[PDB]
RNA sequence: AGCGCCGUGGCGCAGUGGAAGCGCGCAGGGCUCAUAACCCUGAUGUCCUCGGAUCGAAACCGAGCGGCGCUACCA
């Protein structure tokens with residue numbers, strides 16, 4: 160029971176960019192289904208099909224696959240779509256490819272949710288997806304902040320709480336990303352004692368490791384020491400590793416040696 | 427049904443094993459071949475000289491069994507910049523009945539004091555006459571400072587000549603003259619190829635090799651047919667080493683010193699740095715006993731350049747953590763060989779070719795850094811290493827002011843500029859710091875055919891000193 | 897030794913969260929009197945092993961097979 164379109168209104172809009180699964184081709188193109196809005200079909204017309212000249216009709220369509228699309232005039236009376244494929248900007252295709260995949264994942268999760276709860280998708284998107292899209296602009300960003308922050312479900316009225324529990328479990332299992340921020344610090348020392356200073360630096364860099372983020376400067380060479388961190392929020396590893404670099408500098412400036420940075424902390 | 431490893435173990439136990447060195451032995455009575463010294467350290471440094479693509483590490487491997495790394499991907503096959511090493515022990519059979527030529531046998535350092543005799547029929551046991559270290563030298567025409575530094579290290583020579591090739595190899599003559607330069611006279615001639623060459627070609631190559639070495643300084647150099655892969659005529663090599671080559675006078679009456687040629691950063695990748703090791707400099711001790719626990723400094727060390735362009739030389743004091751030699755960590759170091767001194771020197775300092783040709787001294791001495799040096803130099807008449815196709819081997823020219831010359835003071839590789847040229851004396855300005863200890867036999871090379879070419883010898887007579895900054 | 901990279905249908909690229917991919921190859925057919933150009937359909941996958949969650953994984957991850965780029969021979 161797959162239904163319940165991705166965005167606010169059932170019908171396409173003015174100059175909107177979508178994507179289409181194609182099934183059938185009669186004479187003037189293909190009146191074929193959508194999977195960005197409900198499940199309605201639309202005309203792709205041959206004069207407005209491809210950039211090159213239309214040499215073949217079978218190759219460029221690829222029945223049963225995903226394709227770019229733009230709607231010109233929406234038949235907001237009965238459910239018809241006039242649709243285009245040629246006039247989508249090269250930068251526009253890829254950004255819609257995002258929007259489309261963005262929309263698809265939320266449905267992929269809430270499908271599993273409905274099929275396991277046998278509640279029609281319409282009610283689930285009504286109760287959950289639409290308030291999330293209203294609050295955060297995208298249900299995908301709402302899901303990501305749900306992984307981080309629990310307060311995303313406050314102000315929402317699920318049809319049942321077990322839906323929330325299983326959705327949270329499935330999102331923590333499937334939508335799990337902890338980005339590895341890594342850096343390299345070059346020891347350019349020529350000084351008196353360097354290995355004791357390095358041990359002190361490693362201890363002072365490793366005792367700082369928190370419960371959630373643990374920093375281990377691993378060895379791959381003498382000058383080049385590698386700093387690996389698991390940034391849970393993609394914004395704390397930077398400050399951790401900057402503090403680490405400051406502490407390395409505090410170490411090196413007085414024993415006699417010198418060190419330099421080769422790569423700073425990067426995601 | 428005893429496994430081979432347990433068999434080697436019972437052999438090691440029956441051989442006496444490797445006893446630990448005494449912590450503080452009476453150093454007045456310790457001769458270089460004492461059991462406390464020779465069972466766990468090499469005392470004579472033997473180097474292999476020869477033309478490229480002749481096989482020098484293979485010969486030492488057939489003698490000893492220890493491989494010479496041959497690292498750096500590209501250098502896995504062509505030529506190696508840094509010196510290759512192998513430990514060898516000379517075990518002589520105690521039984522008189524077995525023939526003398528096969529009594530000698532060269533074994534790995536991992537062997538024990540008294541290993542069993544492998545000849546079929548001889549129950550007797552071997553006696554370790556001496557441990558010998560092998561300082562392999564690059565044999566190429568571009569890498570020239572490395573072989574001169576190795577010659578500064580080594581104490582006995584093995585010359586390598588191919589049989590089926592041309593007799594008058596120029597690289598071998600260059601090596602022989604270079605060894606002749608620094609008061610070293612014990613060279614043994616070794617014919618690499620004997621299997622693939624005939625009986626009368628054997629006499630012809632013998633005669634050619636004899637005719638080559640008639641006017642040089644070395645006159646009584648033995649010749650031996652050897653094979654690097656057949657693993658034969660190894661015992662006679664050890665015999666010649668034992669008989670012809672004595673120990674030069676070296677005792678503990680002299681002040682301690684060090685000459686580092688290789689750098690080694692002990693930094694095991696992947697493991698936690700909470701368990702890490704120090705920095706190891708590979709150095710020869712030409713004079714002075716060394717022990718576990720010392721304060722030692724390299725003299726040129728940190729070479730910095732200020733905003734005014736003057737060169738500042740910071741000596742690098744370091745507390746030695748260990749003195750690795752042979753196979754086991756030792757408690758006393760026997761001078762006259764390369765020992766890996768592992769100290770608190772920063773690991774990055776021992777990473778690259780940074781500790782290549784640098785003098786080091788223990789606390790209680792003050793070697794002097796010099797920036798302008800007065801040398802007394804002598805030249806040969808013809809260049810060595812050039813293959814002129816039948817015309818008057820390149821004649822050596824007289825020196826010119828303001829030219830870059832590679833002036834290898836012992837192990838140091840310096841590009842000096844000439845200030846004044848006399849008939850026998852000269853002055854050199856060194857942007858790369860050099861130091862003076864006593865006399866420091868020097869080698870000289872220049873640039874005409876691109877790569878460096880040896881010309882003659884030099885000895886320091888005077889210089890301008892730069893006080894190390896505390 | 898470790899850090900980044902990767903895993904053909906013959907090949908190079910691509911998506912990999914819903915199950916077999918493109919283009920070039922090879923086979924066959926079409927157009928032409930006839931060839932190349934062009935147009936159609938194919939026959940080829942343990943998309944590298946052991947596992948996992950999941951109605952789903954070549955694909956998302958991990959205890960490893962294989963080969964590169966990098967530090968680089970680390971006594």
Ligand SMILES: Nc1nc2c(ncn2[C@@H]2O[C@H](COP(=O)(O)OP(=O)(O)CP(=O)(O)O)[C@@H](O)[C@H]2O)c(=O)[nH]1
Pocket residue numbers: 476477478479480481482483484485504505506563564565566618619622652653654655
């Ligand atoms: N037929 C034969 N080949 C030999 C003999 N000795 C060495 N070789 C070959 O020489 C080749 C080079 O070996 P290698 O020892 O690495 O050369 P090298 O002496 O290190 C190069 P350089 O002299 O410049 O230092 C090897 O392939 C080896 O098989 C020999 O006695 N007979």
Ligand SMILES: [Mg+2]
Pocket residue numbers: 483494505506508509510562563564
């Ligand atoms: Mg070599």
